[PDB]
Structure 1
């Protein structure tokens, strides 16, 4: 109820017109500020109590950002495009020691997004579903977050079948990339904690805050 994909698309269009690891971390911190502005544009998100807004963003920021730079890289050959305007090529990541996770992003996310031609509206809805994660611990009202998630995938399904009537299994295909996004998001976080532990690789203030407890 009251979750038009038009508003979701606007949010997407509104927030985005030597060591690759350092560049990636720098791009993440930068995008964390934009993520907040993006979320505020997601219908009903700002109507939730501040505490729940913090919990949802802290719980999904990594998956939310991975989804964004992955879709942005659909045109890129073998690499990803950072929000900073730089490109991280597959070989560069490998030469930096993060080849394993990098290839998972290309194979499980980027490549798949390109093969099915995932559009910005679909991207937005998937990110909105992730944002409204009812399983996030500490939620004062998980039921309300649950209702909002259902409204999103309900509007997403409507969008599909209508925009792509020829592809009846598109809606399910979109949601079935979430498990891979969940797995890749966890691995990327593991690397970040290790980078912070080792000391190398500069980590900015907002990214650092996201690594804080819990």
Structure 2
């Protein structure tokens, strides 16, 4: 149900400060997931497993799509444009370049729309490879329903681009490797945790 995946997308666009910002960011993911058809019908254990397996790729996909508007940076939560400032301070320039060249610029060149992003995120959420699912068949079947619905949407809205569905799915490998590299280099810790630590230390040091 492609209208309802679009609806989920739209509703969502000290070092305690760092824990708080992480809390908020994670909660936005959970609110979006609860609005995806049939997610809330899965056993709660499996819902937890899916959000733990997906949270990282789901955030990256959102800020990558948000950054289409902008040249040579990404827009995060709390509205902030990052060029190579927080990026360069955190030493995550290489990961930033990967986001711009593999996700942002490809989303821009094909004019990926919010329905398409929504469906890709729902596919990532319904990950039947996630370790310890009670019923991966049930998760695979929800994934199938999302991509069948995505294919139908692309064929109706962009019938002159018969390769578009495949092109969307073929961003998911780049999302998976950028997701892994973001965890390896603590991309999230460093970007949430740059200015609150720096300003806190500077003030105490006077």
Alignment of 1:108-127 (within 5 A): 108-127=102-121
Residues 80 and 87 of structure 1 are in contact (CA less than 8 Å); yes or no, is this contact kept in structure 2? yes
Residues 111 and 208 (structure 1), Cα distance of their counterparts in 2 relative to 1, 3 Å cut: farther
Residues 149 and 24 (structure 1), Cα distance of their counterparts in 2 relative to 1, 3 Å cut: farther
SS of the aligned residue for 2:157 comes to coil
Q: What is the rounded CA distance, in whole Å, between the counterparts of 1:122 and 1:46 in structure 2?
A: 22
- Asked which structure has the greater CA Rg, the reply is 2
Cα distance, 1:93 vs structure 2: 1.7
Residues 29 and 206 of structure 1 are in contact (CA less than 8 Å); yes or no, is this contact kept in structure 2? no
Alignment of 1:201-212 (within 5 A): none
Q: What is the rounded CA distance, in whole Å, between the counterparts of 2:120 and 2:55 in structure 1?
A: 13
Residues 80 and 88 of structure 1 are in contact (CA less than 8 Å); yes or no, is this contact kept in structure 2? yes
**Structure 1: 5+ residue runs without aligned partners?**
none
Residues 122 and 198 (structure 1), Cα distance of their counterparts in 2 relative to 1, 3 Å cut: closer
SS of the aligned residue for 1:65 comes to helix
Residues 81 and 194 (structure 1), Cα distance of their counterparts in 2 relative to 1, 3 Å cut: closer
Q: How many residues are paired up?
A: 206
The two structures have a TM-score, normalised by structure 2, of 0.87
Residues 92 and 187 of structure 2 are in contact (CA less than 8 Å); yes or no, is this contact kept in structure 1? no
The two structures have a TM-score, normalised by structure 1, of 0.83
Q: What RMSD over aligned residues (CA atoms) do the two structures have, in Å?
A: 6.0
Cα distance, 1:96 vs structure 2: 3.5
Residues 194 and 128 (structure 1), Cα distance of their counterparts in 2 relative to 1, 3 Å cut: closer
Q: Deviations over 1:126-154 (max 9, x none)?
A: 00000000000100000000000000000
Cα distance, 1:160 vs structure 2: 0.3
Q: What is the rounded CA distance, in whole Å, between the counterparts of 1:211 and 1:123 in structure 2?
A: 45
**Which residue number in structure 2 is paired with residue 152 of structure 1?**
146
Q: What is the rounded CA distance, in whole Å, between the counterparts of 1:188 and 1:99 in structure 2?
A: 11
Q: What is the rounded CA distance, in whole Å, between the counterparts of 1:66 and 1:210 in structure 2?
A: 34
Residues 133 and 146 of structure 1 are in contact (CA less than 8 Å); yes or no, is this contact kept in structure 2? yes
The structure that is helix-richer by fraction is: 2
Residues 163 and 30 (structure 1), Cα distance of their counterparts in 2 relative to 1, 3 Å cut: same
Residues 27 and 83 of structure 1 are in contact (CA less than 8 Å); yes or no, is this contact kept in structure 2? no
Cα distance, 1:97 vs structure 2: 1.1
Residues 90 and 194 of structure 2 are in contact (CA less than 8 Å); yes or no, is this contact kept in structure 1? no
Residues 54 and 15 (structure 1), Cα distance of their counterparts in 2 relative to 1, 3 Å cut: same
